[PDB]
């Protein structure tokens, strides 16, 4: 039938770990339905960049877990890699031995942030009893055993261990050094009075605006002392960094001004990352001036994202004073937002 | 023992296809299930987990002796299991898919682990000209692959955005300096061929061109510089790499590209030339491969060629290239003995 | 307001609408506030 | 009584691994006892600087293993740190 | 399922000892059996394996409440097993061991585990003055931690191959240079007391001293340079660490030494000044430590000081030091809020 | 005090937070005093 | 099955420790050697000049 | 050639090896054929 064999050996690689969690005076840890409290993160030591943390609920969720204490295991972070693992929660008694050691049927599938565990892990009422010896002076002490499995491979044959190795590209870092060393610079970029310098062909081929302002057949005069006015030193130096090595580390904190500069400079890529930063910094108050910026700067993707966000967050964004200021100053923006919400989520009926 | 999640799980699929033509299918002649191992290819979007196709001209096991078994392979990954689904298809003489069959479920993939289909196609049926599956005796197979990501909940922001982030298109415009020619800033000469390029990029991308031009030759030879140990054909792809960082037609003139690379210490070009010359591990090249190696100090290529020579010594010795190279360069076989003895000191 | 909300997709295609909104944006702002509750659920 | 308790609970660390030394044409491997032939050096991958190599004989050393095969496992290299490991052998039939 | 190594092995022990003492044993009063802990210490050779002593002034639970137990806990290691032996013995009033109790075998050690003897010593007997075991209410214990290594034939040629190499005496060499003060070049002075030194070595250790000697100012400076921040005693120890770097008396001369160190940006010994101030995080000092740390960029101790204050805030904040602090420099507590708000379970 | 404790994270970048810290520091000090018993568990 | 016998604890710190670097002394003596940094001596090796600190 | 193949691990270390092999290579080639053609193709 339709199958898929291997003609190889499927070999299971596995290493296990265990961890304990102490909660002093657990009885004084608040008492009502569904109070999720987390554990400090932890690791085995040979984790290879992989953490874990627990999620105990003293009183669980759903309905009939009122007299139960549910537990779960959440993966804190990982290098965006799928995970499969097995766990076993246990309770240290007054004498220091596992009592409620139950294991899952199999190893469960995992991803970053996904919670697995045992709902109705232990009934709360019997745990409250002091005869069971599970709470010495209310110093609760959990203990879990975890068996992470990998299922990689290894073999001796085929002489294939070395097939060549190749390092990664260094053009951007070479352009990074070209920025830092700044050797053979041909154009002295003056911004805010203070002087920086750059190389001709880089910006000559980079953007249409820069190419346009050098190809006016009068280069050697202006290029020696080119005057640039609207920009500030921080924005222009980060701009040059991006133009050289394609990286702008402080984009989030310098978004709108770089967007305006790119609009003047006609730089599509940095403009799009600026749109990404502005959309991924949204609040309930900034959206109006972001619309003003976008319509003033052709931020179409940011425009649709922002107007959709405002259409969703209407009931509190409209009460903002800045929204009314934008309404008074800039009617076309609210007109287009009205148009967008018009033929959507209300043509009924 | 059941445990829920109380969270939302969402599946993505970033798919990709890789066609391949095996020219001269009838005389491939890799019998007893000997692999005609394909050329590796990457994922396109997020090129960080490479791929390669593994093929049997004669299907492995005697059950598939009359069939041409096909089985996908995974070469390299960052130590994780992939769950990708795949499709196969054979193109006819007109280039249209004929033999389509799809995996019902997404098989689990790990590095060094393989899944696929036996009894892919009968060998004589594929060899029959009536079916039209062999235009110019070029067996063509079109493979569509699909990788499943399966993250959870997209975090608590809903991150619609879109925000199309293309790559950093440096090499496109950095070569636009060449093809547009942009009234550039210096000149090169190769057997009278007129080449016209930029000082600054050559200075940036290596210490060799940087140092030599600015070592008093930029003054009298700012524009016109003479280079004579190179040919215009190899020079073309070499200066194309100096523009791009990726050479389109690299493997064709790979040896002379390596010569120019070690002449200019272009370590990235050197390592691609090492890989390209490694594409042709054969029983009738190793002498010239070692000549390229010692002439250029190709360390990884030296190691791999030495190991292949040690494995294939019985056939290697019969080459007249072997005795000629030994006559010219005994010392090379001296380090070859240093390697092989090191492999077998105890016993 | 309600009629325009119902027939927006072709009512907004009038030159008179353009003249009204540029001359009187506040009225369409009031309509925007009215439709904000309408489009709340989803 | 005489005791030095560790003041801590018992937690144990274990790492699993398996290695496959495939050998073709074993039947003509210079059949005489006392010879040394070993597998290529290998490791877990998550080893943290700890390698291994397998060792087999054409004919087992000494006299009790005249007909048997003597199998041994050698730690190729380590950071001069002692190891407690439990090994197991079998054959791919 | 057995085998043999077919190899030779030999036992070796690179042993050492560590003097350690605590003040005012009469009224230490760490009730419940809370640990009174020593400082980190290694064996000398292989400095990257550090021991420390954990002591219970009151043994845990009723079985050892009336006695005083003694133990030793490893601080950290390079992730390896150890099979050490230890000897416990307190000196009497004559400075000689009398309460000598020894382990009968070499126990196995891992990072975080401790080995020793519960029910160690009779507490009231030790506290009684008739026995003469607490001169000036001081318990001068002397431990001899002997660590065994073992090996397989030392990669066997045997061919011992190794003579008894001495150790690099560079510190002792520069110690002889200064403490005997031969061949002095440059003269310093503080508070009327004069001293003299070699310029180049000081420049070697100190960037700033080089800076205020690199700019041609030697003709008036070298003979008559004066220093103001530091008093003659701490000046003596100051010169001492520039020559030495092995901090001999950091503890009793810790704080102003840290201040003068950051006045000259003395990086690794800045770090060991934070080590000096590390093991005294108490209920009252913490405000002063935090103030000086943020005055002197003690980043690692800044983090740990705010951590200790954050944990013990509920009772530590009540001191008058906190009152004068928040009166004077409450922006420090603003930074404290910045840290702890994004920490310690921001619920909630 | 309780709501500011619950929203400390986004409260930080508020300019008024640094304003009252500069002008009236003992108030946020007492806010810490509230936070002391607040986060006893975990 | 390679055993290692590791131990872990729920809560930690308390007294704790702070990361101290290894002794960086010496090779700044090497800095004196190579940069020569206010020399103090003159040497001859068959006329081959060299300088050092006394 | 058998003795050299057996005892290579220390017989390499001689300087007479370097003198001989630079002076006369064809017997080094003989050694490589002897060791490689047999008592080695296993794998």
Short mmCIF file of C-alpha atoms in Angstrom, two decimals, chain A residues 168-175 206 244, chain B residues 167-179 197-198 201-202 204-206 234-250 257 266 268-269 272:
data_model
loop_
_atom_site.label_atom_id
_atom_site.label_comp_id
_atom_site.label_asym_id
_atom_site.label_seq_id
_atom_site.Cartn_x
_atom_site.Cartn_y
_atom_site.Cartn_z
CA UNK A 168 28.60 32.65 5.70
CA UNK A 169 28.55 35.89 3.71
CA UNK A 170 30.51 38.91 4.95
CA UNK A 171 29.60 41.54 2.32
CA UNK A 172 27.37 43.43 4.77
CA UNK A 173 30.06 43.30 7.46
CA UNK A 174 32.57 44.29 4.78
CA UNK A 175 30.26 47.18 3.95
CA UNK A 206 21.12 53.10 -3.78
CA UNK A 244 26.01 50.20 3.95
CA UNK B 167 16.00 40.63 1.11
CA UNK B 168 18.68 43.29 1.20
CA UNK B 169 18.99 43.68 -2.59
CA UNK B 170 22.58 44.86 -2.46
CA UNK B 171 23.93 42.56 -5.17
CA UNK B 172 21.21 43.59 -7.63
CA UNK B 173 22.19 47.26 -7.54
CA UNK B 174 25.78 46.50 -6.56
CA UNK B 175 25.93 44.81 -9.96
CA UNK B 176 23.82 47.65 -11.35
CA UNK B 177 27.04 49.60 -10.91
CA UNK B 178 28.43 47.22 -13.54
CA UNK B 179 25.66 46.74 -16.10
CA UNK B 197 34.91 49.40 -12.33
CA UNK B 198 35.09 51.11 -8.91
CA UNK B 201 34.38 48.19 -3.68
CA UNK B 202 37.63 46.40 -4.55
CA UNK B 204 36.35 47.08 0.71
CA UNK B 205 35.97 43.44 -0.27
CA UNK B 206 39.56 42.17 0.17
CA UNK B 234 37.22 33.52 -15.80
CA UNK B 235 37.76 37.20 -14.98
CA UNK B 236 34.12 37.89 -15.88
CA UNK B 237 32.68 35.59 -13.22
CA UNK B 238 35.42 36.63 -10.79
CA UNK B 239 34.55 40.33 -10.92
CA UNK B 240 30.88 39.30 -10.99
CA UNK B 241 31.47 37.65 -7.61
CA UNK B 242 33.25 40.81 -6.45
CA UNK B 243 29.99 42.57 -7.29
CA UNK B 244 27.55 39.98 -5.96
CA UNK B 245 28.97 37.60 -3.40
CA UNK B 246 27.20 34.83 -5.35
CA UNK B 247 28.54 33.64 -8.71
CA UNK B 248 25.89 32.36 -11.19
CA UNK B 249 28.23 30.37 -13.49
CA UNK B 250 30.81 29.24 -10.93
CA UNK B 257 38.40 30.81 -10.46
CA UNK B 266 39.07 35.73 -1.72
CA UNK B 268 34.57 32.96 0.25
CA UNK B 269 35.29 32.44 -3.46
CA UNK B 272 32.93 27.82 -3.12
#
